[PDB]
Ligand binder design. Structure first.
Ligand SMILES: CC(C)(COP(=O)(O)OP(=O)(O)OC[C@H]1O[C@@H](n2cnc3c(N)ncnc32)[C@H](O)[C@@H]1OP(=O)(O)O)[C@@H](O)C(=O)NCCC(=O)NCCS
Ligand SMILES: CC(C)(COP(=O)(O)OP(=O)(O)OC[C@H]1O[C@@H](n2cnc3c(N)ncnc32)[C@H](O)[C@@H]1OP(=O)(O)O)[C@@H](O)C(=O)NCCC(=O)NCCS
Lengths: 311, 311
């Protein structure tokens, strides 16, 4: 069984507060907090790109996993903001990490990308093909934000998270998963000709508030478990109201759902692993815990994983 | 075992001849032919994007496979020229094809992308997770070509190729594969700030002429076969001199190597499946044939597959 051997992240230093944003566009700290839950989000420096953030997250994850870059068989990077289209971020960090035997691709599934990558890595490991797969979710959303558009500029931040995936013992490891998509919703969230993100907020909200809870129940079910068996929920961190609907569907207490949206905003493919590190560092996730992760992104993509933490 | 159930392509109508290119830049039909083997390459219309080409190729492949879009579990699209970064091409055709149950991601490994996708699909099928995986290599290289740069503008064309991957019977199916990368070579082939491809031609040539033959021998070996067992070789169609080195390494006759570079030029991730359709339509590939495919791309990525044709 494939499981998670270690996790790491890179959080940019610069903080953008809601009062910072009150000078940039016509918004209010009150509106942002009440409608999204966001208070702050980090912004990468103009000389910091997805590659920089991804290699930092990756090093932390390799160190925590006790895995040398030399032993990586594959590097997957979920991003829509590579430094450039090619060389990919995965190729770049394969070089900067010294993972010379690893293959490398970038995958594109917007905010669900980390879920696609972890599941892809699982297949390569449980086939016996590969042993160690590095999976990075990284996004410099600030580089594709129209910073004069209040409807999106108060939502996005930058960051990177990474996990080393590999064989784990006994009951441990990824128990079940779900990947999905609906291109019908492509009109509702797209990158335009200016490299500016355009969103029909209300439409994405309606779709996500239904699909995130259903994907969660689906993986619990496929894992042969009950709602009562879930120890922690790590949803995509885009809107506290969407996260709360998922929590309600799983009948989980507040303390069993990761919430970092108030401090990092929506970091797309980086959001789940960033939150995962936060709870691990807080000691809130233990070996043996059944953890449900669920993500939702542009193109209308989604994914979910049930994992039993530990090696 | 996962194998290829059907294949299809989309070839743009507009032909760009070497004499067409003689008016655009300072080149000669003689130089282009002697140094690359290219005579013509197709160019998509200004209103034709990767999504259009990919859906056309995909329909042809579904029809040949006798597979309804409704039954697709996953759509992978290898491209670096999506209509826009998100919605992805895979999401867009998931919609246009009516493949509502399928998940969808785009993967990025430049000219090796189709190989990464097929191998990814194999893992999902041989795990028992999925049954039908659509894999498309599509590129509108004309949209990232500096058409005033002779060093690259005489090399690239547009197109799309697609395969339906699924379980096949007995000895059939993908016998072995290799995926690799070397981010060290990222400096030698990259997309610049103008969305223009920049290449150190001589350096990419040196690397590809060594790696393509070695990847071929590696998959033959892992499949437990000999050079004498190979019935056909489908290399990436970028330079007849690079293809010829691979042929020489495998001691294969001319007639057992696909050559379409003279008519389509380098179409990156689309090149191998386009050539595969060409030989199938010519009747040169039969059920039971051991086919070696090998590709090499920017970021310095590469991949190879040995497959026994048939279902
Ligand atoms: C984007 C989102 C935060 C907006 O919240 P919402 O409840 O949809 O808000 P609405 O779009 O209905 O607009 C509510 C009002 O606030 C206004 N408004 C929008 N952005 C505002 C801002 N930054 N500051 C103040 N008012 C704002 C709207 O114009 C509207 O005013 P009106 O009623 O006078 O026309 C929310 O829909 C969302 O997060 N959607 C899901 C997106 C997701 O899942 N994340 C992935 C994105 S990559
Ligand atoms: C790009 C490539 C066709 C160029 O051929 P090459 O043998 O490397 O040619 P060189 O770069 O050594 O240049 C040879 C000469 O031709 C010239 N030249 C380059 N492009 C030319 C053109 N279009 N027309 C005429 N002369 C040209 C060079 O300036 C040089 O002239 P010089 O000796 O006076 O300086 C070849 O290197 C190649 O295909 N490389 C591999 C790329 C690959 O694998 N494909 C992936 C790309 S996405």
């Amino acid at each position: 069984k494939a499981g998670i051997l270690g996790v790491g992240r890179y959080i940019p230093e610069k903080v953008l507060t809601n009062h910072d944003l009150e000078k940039m566009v016509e918004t209010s700290d009150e509106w942002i907090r009440t409608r999204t839950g966001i208070e702050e989000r980090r912004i990468a420096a103009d000389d910091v790109f997805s590659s920089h953030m991804a290699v930092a997250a990756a090093k932390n994850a390799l160190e925590q996993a006790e895995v040398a870059a030399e032993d990586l068989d594959m590097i997957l990077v979920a991003t829509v903001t590579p430094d450039q289209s090619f060389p990919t971020v995965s190729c770049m960090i394969q070089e900067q990490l010294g993972a010379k035997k690893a293959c490398a691709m970038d995958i594109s599934a917007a905010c669900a990308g980390f879920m696609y990558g972890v599941v892809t890595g699982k297949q390569f490991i449980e086939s016996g093909t590969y042993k160690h797969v590095l999976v990075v979710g990284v996004e410099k959303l600030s580089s594709i934000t129209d910073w004069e558009d209040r409807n999106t500029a108060v939502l996005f931040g930058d960051g990177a998270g990474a996990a080393v995936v590999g064989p784990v013992s006994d009951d441990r490891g990824i128990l079940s998963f779900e990947l999905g998509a609906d291109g019908t919703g492509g009109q509702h969230l797209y990158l335009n000709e200016k490299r500016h993100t355009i969103m029909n907020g209300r439409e994405v909200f309606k779709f996500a508030v239904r699909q995130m809870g259903e994907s969660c129940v689906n993986v619990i079910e496929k894992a042969g478990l009950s709602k009562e068996d879930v120890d922690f929920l790590i949803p995509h961190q885009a809107n506290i109201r969407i996260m709360e609907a998922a929590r309600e569907r799983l009948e989980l207490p507040v303390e069993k759902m990761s919430k970092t949206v108030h401090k990092y905003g929506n970091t797309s493919a980086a959001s789940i692993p960033i939150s995962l590190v936060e709870e691990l560092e807080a000691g809130k996730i233990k070996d043996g815990d059944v953890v449900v992760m669920v993500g939702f992104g542009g193109g209308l993509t989604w994914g979910a994983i049930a994992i039993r933490w530990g090696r």
